[PDB]
Structure formats: C-alpha cells, structure tokens
Design an enzyme around this catalytic site. Structure first.
Site, PDB file in Angstrom:
ATOM      1  N   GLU A  11       0.800  -1.235   0.000  1.00 31.96           N
ATOM      2  CA  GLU A  11       0.000   0.000   0.000  1.00 31.96           C
ATOM      3  C   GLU A  11       0.832   1.284   0.000  1.00 31.96           C
ATOM      4  O   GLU A  11       0.320   2.363  -0.329  1.00 31.96           O
ATOM      5  CB  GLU A  11      -0.998  -0.008   1.160  1.00 31.96           C
ATOM      6  CG  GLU A  11      -1.893  -1.230   1.151  1.00 31.96           C
ATOM      7  CD  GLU A  11      -3.202  -1.031   0.433  1.00 31.96           C
ATOM      8  OE1 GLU A  11      -3.288  -0.174  -0.471  1.00 31.96           O
ATOM      9  OE2 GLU A  11      -4.174  -1.727   0.799  1.00 31.96           O
ATOM     10  N   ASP A  20      -7.805   5.221  -5.223  1.00 35.45           N
ATOM     11  CA  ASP A  20      -7.100   3.959  -5.397  1.00 35.45           C
ATOM     12  C   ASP A  20      -7.468   3.307  -6.735  1.00 35.45           C
ATOM     13  O   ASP A  20      -8.143   3.911  -7.571  1.00 35.45           O
ATOM     14  CB  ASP A  20      -7.312   3.018  -4.188  1.00 35.45           C
ATOM     15  CG  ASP A  20      -8.758   2.535  -4.036  1.00 35.45           C
ATOM     16  OD1 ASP A  20      -9.473   2.348  -5.046  1.00 35.45           O
ATOM     17  OD2 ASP A  20      -9.182   2.321  -2.879  1.00 35.45           O
ATOM     18  N   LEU A  32      -9.115   3.259   3.214  1.00 32.57           N
ATOM     19  CA  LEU A  32     -10.288   3.617   2.418  1.00 32.57           C
ATOM     20  C   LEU A  32     -11.197   4.529   3.232  1.00 32.57           C
ATOM     21  O   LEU A  32     -11.633   4.178   4.336  1.00 32.57           O
ATOM     22  CB  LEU A  32     -11.055   2.351   1.976  1.00 32.57           C
ATOM     23  CG  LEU A  32     -12.368   2.484   1.185  1.00 32.57           C
ATOM     24  CD1 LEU A  32     -12.063   2.743  -0.267  1.00 32.57           C
ATOM     25  CD2 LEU A  32     -13.217   1.224   1.300  1.00 32.57           C
ATOM     26  N   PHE A 104      -7.772  -6.662   3.926  1.00 35.41           N
ATOM     27  CA  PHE A 104      -7.361  -5.263   4.114  1.00 35.41           C
ATOM     28  C   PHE A 104      -7.579  -4.445   2.821  1.00 35.41           C
ATOM     29  O   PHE A 104      -8.123  -3.347   2.866  1.00 35.41           O
ATOM     30  CB  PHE A 104      -5.892  -5.222   4.573  1.00 35.41           C
ATOM     31  CG  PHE A 104      -5.383  -3.860   4.927  1.00 35.41           C
ATOM     32  CD1 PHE A 104      -5.029  -2.947   3.946  1.00 35.41           C
ATOM     33  CD2 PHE A 104      -5.196  -3.509   6.248  1.00 35.41           C
ATOM     34  CE1 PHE A 104      -4.546  -1.706   4.278  1.00 35.41           C
ATOM     35  CE2 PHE A 104      -4.687  -2.248   6.581  1.00 35.41           C
ATOM     36  CZ  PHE A 104      -4.383  -1.354   5.596  1.00 35.41           C
ATOM     37  N   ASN A 132      -7.178 -18.723  -9.798  1.00 34.65           N
ATOM     38  CA  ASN A 132      -8.534 -18.171  -9.682  1.00 34.65           C
ATOM     39  C   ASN A 132      -8.529 -16.756  -9.129  1.00 34.65           C
ATOM     40  O   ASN A 132      -9.330 -15.926  -9.554  1.00 34.65           O
ATOM     41  CB  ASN A 132      -9.446 -19.078  -8.840  1.00 34.65           C
ATOM     42  CG  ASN A 132      -9.885 -20.350  -9.583  1.00 34.65           C
ATOM     43  OD1 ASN A 132     -10.938 -20.913  -9.285  1.00 34.65           O
ATOM     44  ND2 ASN A 132      -9.082 -20.802 -10.540  1.00 34.65           N
TER      45      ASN A 132
END
Ligand SMILES: CCc1ccccc1
Length: 162
Positions: A11, A20, A32, A104, A132
């Site tokens: 981050e 973002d 956020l 997170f 996946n």
C-alpha cells in the site's frame, strides 16, 4: 517480515486523499475513506477518523495509528465472517498474512464472495487458488497491489517481498 511490513510495501504511503485502483477515495497506508464519488463525503470521514480538521493532510504517527486500526479491523472481519474463519484457520502462518492482506485491500464482503478460491485454499490446492485469484477483478485492476499476495498464496513463503 510481518503483516505490517508486507502492507507497507503493497500500500505504500500517501498523506493526502487519492483515488485507489478501484476508483475509491483513500489516504495513509491503504486507508479507504468512502465508496462515495463525493470528495467532501470522503473529507468528513477523514476528520471523523483523526478527530481534527486536517483538512486532508495527516502526520506519520496518525497514518500509523489508522494502519494499526485497519489491520485489526481486517483480522476481526475475518474472524467474525463464517465463510472466512474456517478457511483462515486451516492456513499456515505465511498464508494467513496473505489472507489478512487480501481483506485489508478488498474488504470482507468482496473476499467472502470467492466461494471456489475459499474451497481451494481450505483443501490446500495452492496452484488453482492462485490462478482463480489472478482472474479476480481485484487483480486485473490493482495488479501490483495484488500480485505479491497471490504469489504468497501459491508458495506460502515471503520471497515475493524479499
Ligand atoms: C481468499 C483469501 C482469504 C482466506 C481466508 C480468510 C480471508 C481471506
């Protein structure tokens, strides 16, 4: 290497609001603010987060305070979610870090939707799960935020962060 160093790498750090990779408003170490498209709604969330008028620029110790809170929320989010907890608890130490890291970034709800990846991970099918996860909208939009996390799930080592 640990969860905090891992997330500080993925981050990084911003001291003012940015959008973002999903287009949402953010500050600090991946904090956020809101899913709203209104900057001012994001600004109110920030002042409410710190306890002062910023107006949009925070200090280092405050960013680190938010970070501690957000790591804690991510772990609690996993432990309180019925889909996440049993899968989480089957995982080895290093992969548990990648799981915390995923939640997170993506939030609990988004991650909880990965029904097959959750089964693959719980059955220890590391290769398929990584494939996946690499098809996720998360990955395709946030590639270098997500890449080391997916690699970590596959290998179960810290080498992607080395
Ligand atoms: C799908 C990764 C994961 C697994 C368990 C808990 C949280 C997140």
């Amino acid at each position: 290497m640990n969860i905090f160093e891992m997330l500080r790498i993925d981050e990084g750090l911003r001291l003012k609001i940015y959008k973002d990779c999903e287009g949402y408003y953010t500050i600090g170490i991946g904090h956020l603010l809101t899913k709203s498209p209104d900057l001012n709604a994001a600004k109110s969330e920030l002042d409410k987060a710190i306890g002062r008028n910023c107006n949009g620029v925070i200090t280092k110790d405050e960013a680190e305070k938010l970070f501690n809170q957000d790591v804690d929320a991510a772990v609690r989010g996993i432990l309180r979610n019925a889909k996440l907890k049993p899968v989480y608890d089957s995982l080895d130490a290093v992969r548990r870090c990648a799981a915390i890291n995923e939640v997170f970034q993506m939030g609990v709800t988004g991650v909880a939707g990965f029904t097959n990846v959750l089964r693959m991970l719980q059955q220890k099918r590391w290769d398929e799960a990584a494939v996946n996860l690499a098809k996720s909208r998360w990955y395709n939009q946030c590639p270098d935020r997500a890449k080391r996390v997916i690699t970590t799930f596959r290998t179960g080592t810290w080498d992607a962060y080395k």
